[PDB]
Design a protein around this ligand. Sequence first.
Ligand SMILES: CCCCCCCCCCC(CCCCCCCCCC)(CO[C@@H]1O[C@H](CO)[C@@H](O[C@H]2O[C@H](CO)[C@@H](O)[C@H](O)[C@H]2O)[C@H](O)[C@H]1O)CO[C@@H]1O[C@H](CO)[C@@H](O[C@H]2O[C@H](CO)[C@@H](O)[C@H](O)[C@H]2O)[C@H](O)[C@H]1O
Ligand SMILES: CCCCCCCCCCC(CCCCCCCCCC)(CO[C@@H]1O[C@H](CO)[C@@H](O[C@H]2O[C@H](CO)[C@@H](O)[C@H](O)[C@H]2O)[C@H](O)[C@H]1O)CO[C@@H]1O[C@H](CO)[C@@H](O[C@H]2O[C@H](CO)[C@@H](O)[C@H](O)[C@H]2O)[C@H](O)[C@H]1O
Ligand SMILES: CC(C)CCC[C@@H](C)[C@H]1CC[C@H]2[C@@H]3CC=C4C[C@@H](OC(=O)CCC(=O)O)CC[C@]4(C)[C@H]3CC[C@]12C
Ligand SMILES: CC(C)CCC[C@@H](C)[C@H]1CC[C@H]2[C@@H]3CC=C4C[C@@H](OC(=O)CCC(=O)O)CC[C@]4(C)[C@H]3CC[C@]12C
Ligand SMILES: CC(C)CCC[C@@H](C)[C@H]1CC[C@H]2[C@@H]3CC=C4C[C@@H](OC(=O)CCC(=O)O)CC[C@]4(C)[C@H]3CC[C@]12C
Ligand SMILES: CC(C)CCC[C@@H](C)[C@H]1CC[C@H]2[C@@H]3CC=C4C[C@@H](OC(=O)CCC(=O)O)CC[C@]4(C)[C@H]3CC[C@]12C
Ligand SMILES: CC(C)CCC[C@@H](C)[C@H]1CC[C@H]2[C@@H]3CC=C4C[C@@H](OC(=O)CCC(=O)O)CC[C@]4(C)[C@H]3CC[C@]12C
Ligand SMILES: CC(C)CCC[C@@H](C)[C@H]1CC[C@H]2[C@@H]3CC=C4C[C@@H](OC(=O)CCC(=O)O)CC[C@]4(C)[C@H]3CC[C@]12C
Ligand SMILES: CC(C)CCC[C@@H](C)[C@H]1CC[C@H]2[C@@H]3CC=C4C[C@@H](OC(=O)CCC(=O)O)CC[C@]4(C)[C@H]3CC[C@]12C
Ligand SMILES: CC(C)CCC[C@@H](C)[C@H]1CC[C@H]2[C@@H]3CC=C4C[C@@H](OC(=O)CCC(=O)O)CC[C@]4(C)[C@H]3CC[C@]12C
Ligand SMILES: CC(C)CCC[C@@H](C)[C@H]1CC[C@H]2[C@@H]3CC=C4C[C@@H](OC(=O)CCC(=O)O)CC[C@]4(C)[C@H]3CC[C@]12C
Ligand SMILES: CC(C)CCC[C@@H](C)[C@H]1CC[C@H]2[C@@H]3CC=C4C[C@@H](OC(=O)CCC(=O)O)CC[C@]4(C)[C@H]3CC[C@]12C
Ligand SMILES: CC(C)CCC[C@@H](C)[C@H]1CC[C@H]2[C@@H]3CC=C4C[C@@H](OC(=O)CCC(=O)O)CC[C@]4(C)[C@H]3CC[C@]12C
Ligand SMILES: CC(C)CCC[C@@H](C)[C@H]1CC[C@H]2[C@@H]3CC=C4C[C@@H](OC(=O)CCC(=O)O)CC[C@]4(C)[C@H]3CC[C@]12C
Ligand SMILES: CC(C)CCC[C@@H](C)[C@H]1CC[C@H]2[C@@H]3CC=C4C[C@@H](OC(=O)CCC(=O)O)CC[C@]4(C)[C@H]3CC[C@]12C
Ligand SMILES: *[C@@H]1O[C@H](CO)[C@@H](O)[C@H](O)[C@H]1NC(C)=O
Ligand SMILES: *[C@@H]1O[C@H](CO)[C@@H](O)[C@H](O)[C@H]1NC(C)=O
Ligand SMILES: *[C@@H]1O[C@H](CO)[C@@H](O)[C@H](O)[C@H]1NC(C)=O
Ligand code: NA
Ligand code: NA
Ligand code: NA
Length: 926
Amino acid sequence: FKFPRSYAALLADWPVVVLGMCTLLIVVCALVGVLVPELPDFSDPLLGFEPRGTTIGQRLVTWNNMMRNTGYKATLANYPYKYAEEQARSWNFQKDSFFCDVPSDGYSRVVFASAGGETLWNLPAIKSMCDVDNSRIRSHPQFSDLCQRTTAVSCCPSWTLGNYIAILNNRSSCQKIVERDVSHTLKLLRTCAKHYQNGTLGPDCWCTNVPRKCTKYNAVYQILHYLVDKDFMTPKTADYAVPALKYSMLFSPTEKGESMMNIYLDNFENWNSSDGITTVTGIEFGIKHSLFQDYLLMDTVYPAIAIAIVLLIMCVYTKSMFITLMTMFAIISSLIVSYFLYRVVFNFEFFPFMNLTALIILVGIGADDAFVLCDVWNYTKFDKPRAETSEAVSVTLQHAALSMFVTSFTTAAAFYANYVSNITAIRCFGVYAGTAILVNYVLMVTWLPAVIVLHERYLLNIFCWAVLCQKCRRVLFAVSEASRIFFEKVLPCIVIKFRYLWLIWFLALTVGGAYIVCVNPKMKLPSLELSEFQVFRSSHPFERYDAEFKKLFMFERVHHGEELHMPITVIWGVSPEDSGDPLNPKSKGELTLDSTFNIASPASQAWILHFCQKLRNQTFFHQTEQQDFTSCFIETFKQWMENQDCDEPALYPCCSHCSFPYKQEVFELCIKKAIMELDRSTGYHLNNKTPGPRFDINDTIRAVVLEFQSTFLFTLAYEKMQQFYKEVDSWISHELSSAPEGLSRGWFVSNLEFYDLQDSLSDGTLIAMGLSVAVAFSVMLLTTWNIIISLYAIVSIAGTIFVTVGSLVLLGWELNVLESVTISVAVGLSVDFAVHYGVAYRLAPDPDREGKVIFSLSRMGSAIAMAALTTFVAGAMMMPSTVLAYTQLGTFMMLVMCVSWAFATFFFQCLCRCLGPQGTCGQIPF
Ligand SMILES: CCCCCCCCCCC(CCCCCCCCCC)(CO[C@@H]1O[C@H](CO)[C@@H](O[C@H]2O[C@H](CO)[C@@H](O)[C@H](O)[C@H]2O)[C@H](O)[C@H]1O)CO[C@@H]1O[C@H](CO)[C@@H](O[C@H]2O[C@H](CO)[C@@H](O)[C@H](O)[C@H]2O)[C@H](O)[C@H]1O
Ligand SMILES: CCCCCCCCCCC(CCCCCCCCCC)(CO[C@@H]1O[C@H](CO)[C@@H](O[C@H]2O[C@H](CO)[C@@H](O)[C@H](O)[C@H]2O)[C@H](O)[C@H]1O)CO[C@@H]1O[C@H](CO)[C@@H](O[C@H]2O[C@H](CO)[C@@H](O)[C@H](O)[C@H]2O)[C@H](O)[C@H]1O
Ligand SMILES: CC(C)CCC[C@@H](C)[C@H]1CC[C@H]2[C@@H]3CC=C4C[C@@H](OC(=O)CCC(=O)O)CC[C@]4(C)[C@H]3CC[C@]12C
Ligand SMILES: CC(C)CCC[C@@H](C)[C@H]1CC[C@H]2[C@@H]3CC=C4C[C@@H](OC(=O)CCC(=O)O)CC[C@]4(C)[C@H]3CC[C@]12C
Ligand SMILES: CC(C)CCC[C@@H](C)[C@H]1CC[C@H]2[C@@H]3CC=C4C[C@@H](OC(=O)CCC(=O)O)CC[C@]4(C)[C@H]3CC[C@]12C
Ligand SMILES: CC(C)CCC[C@@H](C)[C@H]1CC[C@H]2[C@@H]3CC=C4C[C@@H](OC(=O)CCC(=O)O)CC[C@]4(C)[C@H]3CC[C@]12C
Ligand SMILES: CC(C)CCC[C@@H](C)[C@H]1CC[C@H]2[C@@H]3CC=C4C[C@@H](OC(=O)CCC(=O)O)CC[C@]4(C)[C@H]3CC[C@]12C
Ligand SMILES: CC(C)CCC[C@@H](C)[C@H]1CC[C@H]2[C@@H]3CC=C4C[C@@H](OC(=O)CCC(=O)O)CC[C@]4(C)[C@H]3CC[C@]12C
Ligand SMILES: CC(C)CCC[C@@H](C)[C@H]1CC[C@H]2[C@@H]3CC=C4C[C@@H](OC(=O)CCC(=O)O)CC[C@]4(C)[C@H]3CC[C@]12C
Ligand SMILES: CC(C)CCC[C@@H](C)[C@H]1CC[C@H]2[C@@H]3CC=C4C[C@@H](OC(=O)CCC(=O)O)CC[C@]4(C)[C@H]3CC[C@]12C
Ligand SMILES: CC(C)CCC[C@@H](C)[C@H]1CC[C@H]2[C@@H]3CC=C4C[C@@H](OC(=O)CCC(=O)O)CC[C@]4(C)[C@H]3CC[C@]12C
Ligand SMILES: CC(C)CCC[C@@H](C)[C@H]1CC[C@H]2[C@@H]3CC=C4C[C@@H](OC(=O)CCC(=O)O)CC[C@]4(C)[C@H]3CC[C@]12C
Ligand SMILES: CC(C)CCC[C@@H](C)[C@H]1CC[C@H]2[C@@H]3CC=C4C[C@@H](OC(=O)CCC(=O)O)CC[C@]4(C)[C@H]3CC[C@]12C
Ligand SMILES: CC(C)CCC[C@@H](C)[C@H]1CC[C@H]2[C@@H]3CC=C4C[C@@H](OC(=O)CCC(=O)O)CC[C@]4(C)[C@H]3CC[C@]12C
Ligand SMILES: CC(C)CCC[C@@H](C)[C@H]1CC[C@H]2[C@@H]3CC=C4C[C@@H](OC(=O)CCC(=O)O)CC[C@]4(C)[C@H]3CC[C@]12C
Ligand SMILES: *[C@@H]1O[C@H](CO)[C@@H](O)[C@H](O)[C@H]1NC(C)=O
Ligand SMILES: *[C@@H]1O[C@H](CO)[C@@H](O)[C@H](O)[C@H]1NC(C)=O
Ligand SMILES: *[C@@H]1O[C@H](CO)[C@@H](O)[C@H](O)[C@H]1NC(C)=O
Ligand code: NA
Ligand code: NA
Ligand code: NA
């Protein structure tokens, strides 16, 4: 029998036990992790982007549960269906010479710009647009199945300038037009645009106040409204010898959607996008989110190239391809083991596509501890040459293992702090990436020291070319000693000799970053709808369509310019709750009816009439010359009763003789009659969105809905939508507080989905960042046991963060979903170089603060720079990517390494050289 008396003896005496047991546990996690759970589905990028458990979120979830469960023999109905049954017992533009339809937002389309920046209103450009449509769309084998038709002989014509010129100038097609048709149609537009600008000319005049010349085919209206950019025909542009057409649109007679993807993938995806006359600058085929998964999985080639560069750096630093490959195996194993823990142990069903971004992060930050442990091992061999391997192991762990933990933990804690967000995808990403970071640490203090012991024991001897080897060894020596001279002589001189320059420069940058973040221009919230969220780089044609061209065309602007009033919907008899799993996007739970509700009592009838009339007297209510007889159903019912006659006994309980507080049995009787009477007398039809009573399976009223229109207009601005929400919710809450028992539990809902998202981005970032800062300063104290070093560190970290976040604001980032996570993660990353220099400063033998800074830079500079570099390189490799999340994360990684390294190496070490503690000054007791 044999057994090691300590962990340092286990690593030294039995390395193969540690590596064998680790490899076994890893292949078990790999096998069970791929065999047991359902694989991730990335087909919707926006899955999990709704807050869950917010007041507004639960009411919004509840109102959606009510709408899916309303209908014949559903949980709820608009119609009393038991009563309904119980009563029922008693192309060529000369020959054809029209377009098949008006252009619309439902058709597949492309935006053209000029090659070489000239105006598109010329015969070469006009034909080149028709040429691209024929060449790239109508030619495709499934166009003929997808296109609209008048007969099986041919598809409909496309809507483009050349075909409007052909129909107006009696040509057969765009290909047969001549230069006189182009200038004639310009003179027609340039003179008739007046009546479009003034609002007289309109869609269907083929309006008689406009000269007939204009109204032909609706062509002048359709060109100006659909096909040309808004700046073309305005009084400011039209007085030019030729007005400048910068952009034009083409519409295809095929519908937007997943049917477009073969046409896209064959003819557009790998295309040059230019004919040499004109360039396709925007595409709207209805396939942006449907193409996401392909680009997402293809772009995994750049994280793979990043692994090869991080292997080169680490092999040159360690001088060992064995230690290097075994270190990268442990890095990748931490992603596998974290995935097994996440899906099998923690039981997360949802895996957001941002969990794939954890590979880039771990490739970048995974090897930092290997640089530390290898440096400390080499220092330990040098300062104890005659040590037994278990003593060389224990001394190496005594020096390295805590520093390695505080640096891993502060970044993991920053990821886990995002689990306070209400947004499901943010919480799921925080838990997965935080777990991979901690699993990577466990491997760096088990696997990696056992690998270092096997290397030491065997591979120092075991496992023309000899010339190439000797020449390579000579270059590797030169790089070693040049780097040693830099970190141990050059860099300490540059930091210390210019300390008063550095303190002024880095403090001025800190004040500048704080002004940009806290004063002007501050970081903004997202400013477009969730279905308009960017997924590709902004140069992609699908993103340029949304970011530029939706502003420049009149038919697209009409959708923005709409004066849409906020609805005020008030629901009783249902509980506003989210009984689904808040970590699963597809688990919305079931509708919960309220058992204390009662509309039918005389007191409930009386109060809910008075609520309707008191609400109509508010300044938030919009009065209309058209009455709405749906809005408050009890007024329309009271009105109907006051028009019922009494000479037939079959109508008697419903008589006009009855005072309004109807006996409970007359209310639930005559309401059913009134609802059935409506359905055939008026012919008005009730759908799941219509306000009224809701009946259950055997016709008892289990819910009531009211709806009113507001003065407040729907906006994407946070500050104004917060004033609508606070004004109406606090008035309705105050008014409800005096309601009868059985109406005091009602609730208000409206189009608040985007405001709830904005409110959760703002809240979750503040809390996750406050938690991330609290952990960073706490471990800084517990690492250093000195308040002065801990103050200089947290001030350098604060300057790092203000410069990092102010730089993201100058680059034009908003506080959207992944951006909001990077801001707490900045804190967690920014810790590391200040804790490493801070421990080297206290460790220093030298009594004088200058000698302590020289020892700190000398000992620690090499490993700190290798860590910064491998993270910067992992970020730089993501820059060719098509997926926007990969380019945003790689941009953040480069920037935060530069700022973090500069503030740690120069500013923090200059504070230590000017006023760093000596003896026991600032030291904390036990
Ligand atoms: C958390 C992990 C999530 C994993 C999710 C699953 C991903 C599965 C698909 C991964 C994937 C890339 C490789 C990724 C490696 C890293 C994997 C992860 C490991 C950790 C990092 C497989 O790529 C495959 O690689 C094979 C070779 O390995 C190759 O084999 C061939 O040669 C053999 C030899 O002669 C021969 O024998 C065999 O017969 C051949 O066919 C296949 O043809 C090829 O499809 C998909 O991309 C494929 O390749 C291209 C890449 O550029 C990609 O290019 C486009 O987009 C790029 C991006 O914008 C861009 O750069 C390119 O310019 C652009 O053109 C292609 O569209 C796509 O087809
Ligand atoms: C789940 C409930 C859903 C309710 C759905 C309601 C649907 C709308 C019907 C409401 C209704 C019938 C009610 C039938 C009984 C229903 C009982 C139900 C009870 C259970 C809840 C109310 O009928 C009202 O009757 C009153 C008398 O009782 C009468 O009052 C007066 O009395 C004396 C002169 O007769 C006088 O001397 C006295 O001074 C007055 O006071 C009003 O003038 C009259 O409008 C008919 O109102 C008409 O509705 C039209 C659209 O159908 C609507 O059309 C316009 O607007 C449309 C856009 O909106 C648009 O598209 C149309 O193009 C447009 O032309 C009219 O503008 C509207 O006028
Ligand atoms: C070498 C690699 C794989 C790095 C990680 C090594 C270990 C630290 C991991 C690998 C598998 C993990 C185990 C996977 C499954 C479980 C079952 C789980 O079982 C319980 O009964 C939990 C009950 C509860 O929820 O309270 C407890 C944690 C445990 C042992 C895990 C603890 C941590 C383990 C041993
Ligand atoms: C790769 C994973 C998935 C499974 C590995 C399972 C076993 C095949 C491993 C686990 C622990 C290993 C053992 C750990 C320690 C040693 C002591 C080692 O002793 C020595 O002094 C080296 C002698 C030599 O081989 O020259 C001999 C191999 C052995 C028995 C190892 C053989 C292979 C073992 C049984
Ligand atoms: C990035 C991940 C996927 C790497 C996974 C690596 C493993 C498949 C392991 C198992 C056995 C290892 C090999 C065992 C022995 C050697 C001999 C070794 O010979 C040397 O001259 C070592 C010199 C030195 O490093 O000091 C070079 C590495 C290599 C091929 C090892 C490289 C890493 C291997 C292939
Ligand atoms: C760093 C790596 C080595 C470990 C990361 C943990 C893996 C065990 C997980 C994380 C994400 C998973 C992938 C997520 C997505 C896909 C695409 C899927 O193929 C599709 O085309 C899915 C189509 C669809 O369902 O819509 C095949 C499985 C795969 C590669 C999964 C395989 C297992 C992966 C790599
Ligand atoms: C999820 C589970 C598997 C994680 C459990 C943690 C362990 C895998 C690691 C993490 C850091 C390791 C420690 C890092 C540093 C040291 C100091 C080292 O040296 C001393 O204690 C010197 C004592 C002396 O001789 O005076 C001994 C091993 C030890 C305790 C290590 C023991 C194993 C630890 C606790
Ligand atoms: C990417 C960010 C976040 C981290 C930045 C780290 C750099 C400041 C480090 C990484 C590698 C370092 C280099 C490694 C080796 C050398 C050789 C060294 O050569 C000498 O001192 C002269 C030797 C001779 O005279 O032969 C000069 C500095 C330099 C370029 C170093 C400068 C500092 C570098 C660029
Ligand atoms: C630290 C901040 C400002 C951002 C990163 C620094 C870089 C922008 C580099 C590029 C060129 C560098 C400069 C190149 C040459 C010199 C002269 C050098 O003069 C000395 O007296 C050196 C003495 C010695 O050799 O020991 C002092 C540092 C300085 C200003 C360097 C400081 C760091 C600089 C500005
Ligand atoms: C103290 C040091 C160590 C770290 C820096 C912390 C804060 C001073 C900064 C960094 C990022 C800032 C946040 C970035 C973005 C926003 C969105 C912003 O939302 C708005 O409504 C802005 C106007 C609008 O968009 O309508 C509210 C402030 C907030 C949370 C900021 C509050 C102040 C924060 C947390
Ligand atoms: C909100 C935060 C991110 C920025 C503002 C922080 C300031 C309120 C404090 C915190 C630490 C202070 C620094 C602590 C130490 C020094 C070194 C000190 O050096 C000397 O006095 C050198 C000359 C001499 O020794 O006589 C000069 C002031 C300075 C930069 C201080 C200036 C004011 C600082 C930056
Ligand atoms: C290519 C080799 C031979 C020279 C590398 C020179 C370096 C100084 C590297 C380090 C960072 C690199 C930059 C990192 C990022 C970008 C952004 C990239 O644009 C994008 O992909 C947009 C990214 C985003 O949208 O977030 C264009 C190249 C550029 C300037 C890179 C150019 C080359 C740089 C300056
Ligand atoms: C020496 C260290 C600092 C690492 C250097 C990394 C470089 C090799 C990277 C940094 C920026 C990269 C470039 C950033 C952006 C692009 C645009 C990209 O354009 C595309 O059309 C493909 C991507 C897409 O379609 O989204 C082609 C590669 C290229 C030049 C990249 C090639 C690789 C570069 C030069
Ligand atoms: C933007 C920030 C975050 C990172 C910048 C990293 C490097 C690009 C900078 C940091 C310090 C700079 C160095 C500061 C001093 C020198 C010494 C200078 O002179 C010599 O090498 C000879 C010195 C002698 O022995 O006399 C040449 C430029 C160099 C290497 C500089 C090149 C650019 C360096 C490596
Ligand atoms: C802490 C310092 C001493 C060194 C850190 C690395 C530097 C190379 C970083 C820090 C701040 C960065 C700057 C922060 C902000 C901007 C504005 C940014 O955006 C714009 O000017 C607007 C672009 C647009 O039109 O959208 C372009 C890059 C730039 C100059 C950055 C370039 C790289 C800088 C100088
Ligand atoms: C349209 O132009 C006429 C003059 O031709 C002008 O009287 C009228 O006020 C304009 N329309 C509007 C909405 O002002
Ligand atoms: C591709 O686009 C360029 C302009 O960027 C144009 O000159 C060239 O003719 C186009 N076609 C091909 C096949 O390169
Ligand atoms: C009425 O419907 C409920 C289920 O919603 C059922 O429990 C009850 O037995 C039904 N009563 C009659 C008389 O149909
Ligand atoms: Na790194
Ligand atoms: Na670490
Ligand atoms: Na950290």
